């Protein structure tokens, strides 16, 4: 029985691995994999060791081999495999092996915490709870195991159980809370009170109990903000508004710059919808908090009297102009938005008056910043000439302020002059070459101008370039979505442009030029899609970043914040930049679908090959997003040559979004266009329907979709859903947006493409030149 001889050597290899000494552990292992070679334990641990040193491919091979030679295994083998799967983000697989370890008779009860984390990560809390409980039973000593359990119980709806789990520890821990644990205690006291409050619902007696508990724990709760907020809320649900009023006043006093506290105070006093008494309220609060916004500003949202309003508006804006505050207009912009007709003329007169009494020489700060304000004022009102004139005046006086160049650039952007705007920001950048803000603004504008190389070179002034020629890699490294998305939308435009020049080609110079544009169009289509694809990678990483907190939050003692994290994680694929990437990438995927559906020189050629493949090498080093070892497809070639576009879009973008998104934020126009291509014309009727309910059947887009849907009825594709969708019509038997939509399907639906193009170019009159020229250059084109 020399098996004990080899089994002891393995245990040594295991200990060597546990000590983070992989190299050694391998040596001992390779020794066992010579006399035996079919020892599953060593094969597994070898795979794990290989992974730890970066031998990823071979690790997978030894793990694959081990697993193939298993189809049961030793408890340690299953354990070791669980870890490898955890490390390689194979969490469901990890749960299988960690589970098998226990089935095959593992005594290591520490495996339940590993499971609890993994099962939490994949959103399987029903089973996570089972693991939290078993682990809790095996180790009642550590508070983290209690909090873990209460959370699992909380998440599973077992609110009473969660409360009892937290309470239980409190009882055991009475008189044993050292100062270094007071914080975790404070957090668990508030977390419990949270659950009790959730369960209390609108039951008056249950609610009064939660308050009783709140005043019980107050001295040991250090989250005074969180506690007072809870207290106020309970009083409101108890109809004891005077008391709530007191709490809100206390909160306001703690943070008089929080608008929320004020608005809530109004309600507690019953004076909401009573301007006379609100003006009174804020007049008094202004005495207490003279340097805070809410008291000064909130009256500006309701005061109906044109006289008092004008007065209050002046008191708010003019002091800011006098102090040279750049954000003066932005501060009142939401008033321009919600009270445009009432406020803007009052402010126009107010500020125009103010300017007239200013001397450029004696009052230089207020002067230039008053002009600045007015430039934004008229820019907002879409009076660009005046906007230009007032910012011009500011620059005339003082041309050393970065803001004046941004505002100017911004006005030209609205006039549809990207290239020029970019140039103006570039001019301003010289004033503060060490400020990354203006740098980023400049990068963005050059990207809007489709001048990517300039954008990249500017951005690279602030990126950490080490083994690279520019900051493209670091920008991917640090999850800079602002850049990647903007650059992707640039690449797409460059792709459409170069495609035009390629279509505008009709002795051999034309041929050589033809091959060059073909490449660029390919290059840009590929990079546009590859850049958009970087976003879902960022956000899938955000999701994966939760893993360590399933444990860390329990040990640190922040269960409340942890639950919020779970809420955050389940909304990741609804976030703006993500939805933006998805929506914009749909243009590419959808097209790639519609297109996949519709459509001697040896020596010299060898010199031409090594010439174009030599430049491509130089280009790859410049556009490379990820390190060479991690990515071979730098131009997105594989992405664009795909034969499963609609799927890739679903797999990479749409699925995760569609599963997390709230019905009241859903893009039914997108669902429509996605299903229309998937073939599910049933969900198309649902999209148009669900869309019709929220926006009415009068919307031009509502009719556009419908017309494109009617043409679907007859005669495509299977009769069944054609009839179902055809019988569904019982529920329903300008507008540039509508006309532009119908144009996107000028092919599928039979309508005069030329005639429609004319109608769209007539509804453009109103729109600003920026939005105007965007449709004429990229929307409607041959």
């Amino acid at each position: 029985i020399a098996l004990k001889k080899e089994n002891d050597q393995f245990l040594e290899a295991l200990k060597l691995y546990e000590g983070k000494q992989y190299k050694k552990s391998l040596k001992l292992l390779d020794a066992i994999l010579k006399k035996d070679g079919s020892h599953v334990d060593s094969l597994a641990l070898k795979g794990l060791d290989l992974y730890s040193v970066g031998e990823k491919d071979d690790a997978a091979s030894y793990v694959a081999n081990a697993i193939r030679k298993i189809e049961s295994a030793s408890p340690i083998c299953c354990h070791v495999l669980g870890i490898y799967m955890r490390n390689t983000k194979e969490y469901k697989e990890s749960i299988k092996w960690f589970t098998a370890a226990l089935n095959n008779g593992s005594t290591n009860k520490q495996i339940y915490r590993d499971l609890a984390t993994l099962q939490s990560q994949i959103g399987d809390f029903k089973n996570a709870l089972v693991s939290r409980k078993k682990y809790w039973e095996a180790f009642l000593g550590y508070r983290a195991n209690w909090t873990s359990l209460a959370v699992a119980q909380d998440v599973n709806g077992e609110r009473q159980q969660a409360i009892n789990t937290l309470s239980q520890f409190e009882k055991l821990a009475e008189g044993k809370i050292s100062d270094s644990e007071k914080y975790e205690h404070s957090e668990c006291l508030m977390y419990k009170n949270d659950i009790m409050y959730k369960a209390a619902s609108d039951n008056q007696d249950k609610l009064q109990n939660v308050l009783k508990h709140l005043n019980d724990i107050e001295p040991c709760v250090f989250d005074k903000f969180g506690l007072l907020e809870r207290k106020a809320t309970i009083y409101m649900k108890l109809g004891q508004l005077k008391d709530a009023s007191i709490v809100y006043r206390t909160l306001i006093k703690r943070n008089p710059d929080n608008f929320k506290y004020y608005k809530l105070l109004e309600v507690s006093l019953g004076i909401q919808g009573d301007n006379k008494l609100k003006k009174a309220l804020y007049g008094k609060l202004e005495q207490f908090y003279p340097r805070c916004e809410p008291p000064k500003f909130i009256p500006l949202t309701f005061l109906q009297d044109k006289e008092e309003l004008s007065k209050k508006l002046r008191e708010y804006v003019l002091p800011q102009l006098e102090r040279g505050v750049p954000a003066t207009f932005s501060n009142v912009k939401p008033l321009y938005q919600r009270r445009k007709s009432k406020v803007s003329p009052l402010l126009e007169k107010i500020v125009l008056d103010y300017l007239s009494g200013l001397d450029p020489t004696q009052d230089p700060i207020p002067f230039i910043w008053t002009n600045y304000y007015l430039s934004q004022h008229f820019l907002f009102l879409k009076d660009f000439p005046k906007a230009q004139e007032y910012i011009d005046a500011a620059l005339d006086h003082t041309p050393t302020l970065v803001e004046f160049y941004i505002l100017k650039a911004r006005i030209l952007k609205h006039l549809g002059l990207m290239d020029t705007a970019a140039g103006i920001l570039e001019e301003g950048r010289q004033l503060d070459l060490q400020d990354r803000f203006i740098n980023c603004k400049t990068v963005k504008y050059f990207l809007r101008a489709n001048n990517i190389d300039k954008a990249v070179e500017v951005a690279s002034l602030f990126t950490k370039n080490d083994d690279s020629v520019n900051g493209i890699k670091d920008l991917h490294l640090v999850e800079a979505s602002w850049f990647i998305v903007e650059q992707a939308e640039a690449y797409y435009r460059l792709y459409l442009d170069r495609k035009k020049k390629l279509d505008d080609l009709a002795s051999e110079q034309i041929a050589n030029d033809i091959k060059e544009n073909q490449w660029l169009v390919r290059k840009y289509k590929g990079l546009a899609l590859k850049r958009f694809n970087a976003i879902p990678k960022f956000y899938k990483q955000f999701e994966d970043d939760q893993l360590d907190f399933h444990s860390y939050c329990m040990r640190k003692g922040t269960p409340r914040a942890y639950l919020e994290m779970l809420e955050w994680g389940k909304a990741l694929y609804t976030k703006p930049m993500y939805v933006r990437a998805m929506k914009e990438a749909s243009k590419l995927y959808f097209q790639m679908h519609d297109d996949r559906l519709k459509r001697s020189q040896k020596k010299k050629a060898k010199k031409e090959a090594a010439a174009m493949n030599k430049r491509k090498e130089t280009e790859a080093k410049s556009v490379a997003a990820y390190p060479s070892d991690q990515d071979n497809d730098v131009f997105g070639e594989k992405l664009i040559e795909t034969s499963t576009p609609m799927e890739d879009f679903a797999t990479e973008f749409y699925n995760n979004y569609s599963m997390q998104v709230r019905e009241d934020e859903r893009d039914y126009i997108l669902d429509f266009e996605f299903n229309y291509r998937i073939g599910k014309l049933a969900l198309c009727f649902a999209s148009l329907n669900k869309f019709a309910k929220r926006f009415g059947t009068t919307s031009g887009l509502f009719g556009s979709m419908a017309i494109v849907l009617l043409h679907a009825t007859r005669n495509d594709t299977p009769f069944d859903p054609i009839l179902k969708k055809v019988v569904t019509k019982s529920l329903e038997k300008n507008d540039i947006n509508g006309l532009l939509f119908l144009y996107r399907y000028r092919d599928d639906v039979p309508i005069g493409s030329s005639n429609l193009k004319e109608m769209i170019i007539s509804s453009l009159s109103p729109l600003e030149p920026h939005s105007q020229n965007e449709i004429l250059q990229y929307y409607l084109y041959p």
């Binding site: 914080y183 250090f222 005074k224 903000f225 007191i246 006043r249 206390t250 006093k253 943070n255 710059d257 929080n258 608008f259 929320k260 006093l269 008494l277 309220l281 008094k284 609060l285 005495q287 207490f288 340097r291 916004e293 809410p294 909130i298 949202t301 309701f302 505050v325 750049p326 954000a327 932005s330 501060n331 009142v332 939401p334 938005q337 009270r339 007709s341 009432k342 803001e403 941004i406 060490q434 400020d435 990354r436 950490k464 640090v478 999850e479 800079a480 602002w482 990483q541 955000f542 939050c553 640190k556 922040t558 409340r560 914040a561 919020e564 703006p576 930049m577 939805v579 933006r580 929506k583």
Partner: protein
């Protein structure tokens, strides 16, 4: 106008964006998660706000937007010192980062964010002192932290930042005005 409030994890994506725009010192999301999920009562944000009037309803696909009609203009990212070596040492905090869009200066935002941060450290974590770093050429910050917030310049760290600039390491230990008494009725006359 600008609203000031405690931060939650719903802010960190935008917080990362502000940082990426305003500073060369950048961190991965997990580093923000680490802060917000360790000291959930310590960091604050300054945002714009669009109140309903008596007369911007959807979120713009813009990387600074926290919610409809609400975009981040500033933040102060805060932590307690959790180095095991200093585990025995008295509890102290650190300002990992403070950033305010330059277009929103001369409005006391950075100060407001700080005054809350400091109080949060004193109240929630019984912090006995707090410290942070600023570039030597930062005179506005130096002025704010020392002349207004009473920090002291503890050290001058040579070649602290990526571009080789020296930092000022600063630390700080933790009447009859008119104020709400929190009893009397606010409305009268």
């Amino acid at each position: 106008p600008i609203n000031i409030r405690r931060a939650t994890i719903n802010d960190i994506i935008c917080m990362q964006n502000a940082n990426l725009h305003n500073l060369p010192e950048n961190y991965m999301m997990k580093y923000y998660m680490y802060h917000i999920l360790s000291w959930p009562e310590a960091s604050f944000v300054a945002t714009t706000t669009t109140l309903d009037c008596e007369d911007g309803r959807t979120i713009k696909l813009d990387p600074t937007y926290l919610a409809p009609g609400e975009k981040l203009v500033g933040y102060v990212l805060v932590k307690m010192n959790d180095d095991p070596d200093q585990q025995n040492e008295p509890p102290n905090g650190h300002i990992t980062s403070l950033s305010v869009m330059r277009t929103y200066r001369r409005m006391g935002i950075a100060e407001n964010l700080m005054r809350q941060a400091l109080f949060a450290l004193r109240e929630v974590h019984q912090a006995e002192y707090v410290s942070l770093h600023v570039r030597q050429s930062n005179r506005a910050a130096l002025h704010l932290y020392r002349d207004t917030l009473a920090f002291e310049v503890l050290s001058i760290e040579k070649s602290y930042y990526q571009d080789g600039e020296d930092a000022y390491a600063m630390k700080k230990v933790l009447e009859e005005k008119l104020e709400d008494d929190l009893e009397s009725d606010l409305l009268e006359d």
